[PDB]
Amino acid sequence: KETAAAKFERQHMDSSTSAASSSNYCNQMMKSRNLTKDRCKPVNTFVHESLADVQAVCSQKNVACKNGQTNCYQSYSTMSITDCRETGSSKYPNCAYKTTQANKHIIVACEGNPYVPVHFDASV
Ligand SMILES: [K+]
């Protein structure tokens, strides 16, 4: 049903804030993006730059992907991200997360026309 590009936006884009707004940000966001739909997804990163700036990474530094595929790119600039990681007391569907705000380079895989992120590979 969902395209890879759309799934990337749903899982990974949040340009409505410049940084995580509270320790509760991940709990809210993982739910609202359907990352707690069938289970508590263990780990997920949200990026807080404009969609234009994130899509632009697909025109930046070409690097290998973790899986050995070739169409990954590392942002030239650091970018505002939030890491959401599940905690020990989490019981589905009351999924509980620790929130960590950071300013990291992102690495994404890109596909399509327009050429846009379809996978979040890592941050550095
Ligand atoms: K992630």
Coordinates of C-alpha atoms and ligand atoms in Angstrom, one line a residue:
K1 CA 0.0 0.0 0.0
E2 CA 2.6 2.6 1.2
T3 CA 5.5 3.7 -1.1
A4 CA 9.0 3.5 0.3
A5 CA 9.3 7.3 0.0
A6 CA 6.0 7.8 1.9
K7 CA 7.1 5.3 4.6
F8 CA 10.3 7.3 5.0
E9 CA 8.4 10.5 5.6
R10 CA 6.0 8.8 8.1
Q11 CA 8.8 7.1 10.0
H12 CA 11.5 9.7 9.9
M13 CA 10.4 13.3 9.1
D14 CA 9.2 15.8 11.7
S15 CA 9.9 19.3 10.5
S16 CA 7.3 20.8 12.7
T17 CA 9.8 21.3 15.6
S18 CA 13.5 22.2 15.6
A19 CA 14.2 19.7 18.4
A20 CA 12.5 17.2 20.7
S21 CA 10.0 19.3 22.8
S22 CA 10.0 17.0 25.9
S23 CA 11.1 13.7 27.4
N24 CA 7.6 12.7 26.2
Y25 CA 8.2 13.5 22.6
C26 CA 9.1 10.0 21.6
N27 CA 6.1 8.4 23.3
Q28 CA 3.7 10.8 21.4
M29 CA 5.5 10.6 18.1
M30 CA 5.9 6.8 17.9
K31 CA 2.2 6.5 18.4
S32 CA 1.1 9.2 16.0
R33 CA 3.2 7.8 13.2
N34 CA 1.9 4.3 13.7
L35 CA 5.2 2.9 14.9
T36 CA 3.4 1.3 17.9
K37 CA 0.6 0.0 15.6
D38 CA 1.2 -3.8 15.8
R39 CA 4.1 -3.8 18.2
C40 CA 6.5 -1.3 19.9
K41 CA 9.2 -0.6 17.3
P42 CA 12.4 -0.8 19.3
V43 CA 14.4 2.1 17.8
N44 CA 13.5 5.0 15.4
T45 CA 15.1 8.4 14.5
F46 CA 13.2 11.5 13.6
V47 CA 14.8 14.3 11.6
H48 CA 13.9 18.0 12.3
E49 CA 15.0 19.7 9.2
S50 CA 12.8 20.8 6.3
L51 CA 11.7 18.2 3.8
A52 CA 13.6 20.1 1.1
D53 CA 16.8 19.9 3.2
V54 CA 16.4 16.2 3.9
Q55 CA 15.6 15.3 0.3
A56 CA 18.7 17.3 -0.7
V57 CA 20.9 14.8 1.1
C58 CA 20.2 12.5 -1.9
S59 CA 22.5 14.9 -3.9
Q60 CA 25.3 14.9 -1.3
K61 CA 28.1 12.4 -0.3
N62 CA 27.5 9.0 -2.0
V63 CA 28.4 6.2 0.5
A64 CA 27.8 2.5 0.8
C65 CA 24.7 1.4 2.7
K66 CA 25.1 -0.9 5.8
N67 CA 23.6 -3.8 3.7
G68 CA 26.3 -3.3 1.0
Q69 CA 24.0 -1.5 -1.5
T70 CA 25.4 1.6 -3.1
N71 CA 22.6 4.3 -3.2
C72 CA 23.2 5.8 0.2
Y73 CA 24.2 9.4 1.0
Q74 CA 25.7 11.2 4.0
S75 CA 24.6 14.7 4.7
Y76 CA 27.3 17.3 4.4
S77 CA 25.9 19.2 7.3
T78 CA 24.9 18.0 10.7
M79 CA 21.1 17.9 11.2
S80 CA 18.8 18.1 14.2
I81 CA 17.6 14.6 15.0
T82 CA 15.8 12.8 17.9
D83 CA 16.5 9.2 18.7
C84 CA 13.6 7.2 20.2
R85 CA 14.6 3.9 22.0
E86 CA 12.2 1.6 23.9
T87 CA 12.6 1.2 27.7
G88 CA 12.3 -1.9 29.9
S89 CA 8.8 -1.2 31.3
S90 CA 7.2 -0.8 27.9
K91 CA 4.3 -3.2 27.3
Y92 CA 2.4 -3.0 24.0
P93 CA 0.4 -1.0 23.2
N94 CA 1.6 1.2 26.1
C95 CA 4.9 1.6 24.3
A96 CA 7.5 3.6 26.3
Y97 CA 10.6 5.4 24.9
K98 CA 13.7 7.3 25.9
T99 CA 14.2 10.5 24.0
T100 CA 17.7 11.6 22.9
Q101 CA 18.2 14.9 21.0
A102 CA 21.4 15.2 18.9
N103 CA 22.9 17.1 15.9
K104 CA 24.4 14.4 13.6
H105 CA 25.0 13.7 10.0
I106 CA 22.3 11.5 8.5
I107 CA 22.8 8.6 6.1
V108 CA 19.8 7.7 3.8
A109 CA 19.2 5.4 0.8
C110 CA 17.5 7.2 -2.1
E111 CA 15.3 6.1 -5.0
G112 CA 12.8 7.5 -7.5
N113 CA 12.0 10.7 -9.5
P114 CA 12.2 12.9 -7.6
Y115 CA 15.2 11.2 -6.0
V116 CA 14.3 11.1 -2.3
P117 CA 15.1 9.1 0.8
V118 CA 13.5 5.6 1.0
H119 CA 15.5 4.3 4.0
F120 CA 17.2 5.7 7.1
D121 CA 20.5 3.9 7.3
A122 CA 22.3 5.6 10.2
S123 CA 23.5 8.8 11.8
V124 CA 27.1 10.0 12.4
Ligands
K1 K 15.8 4.8 12.8

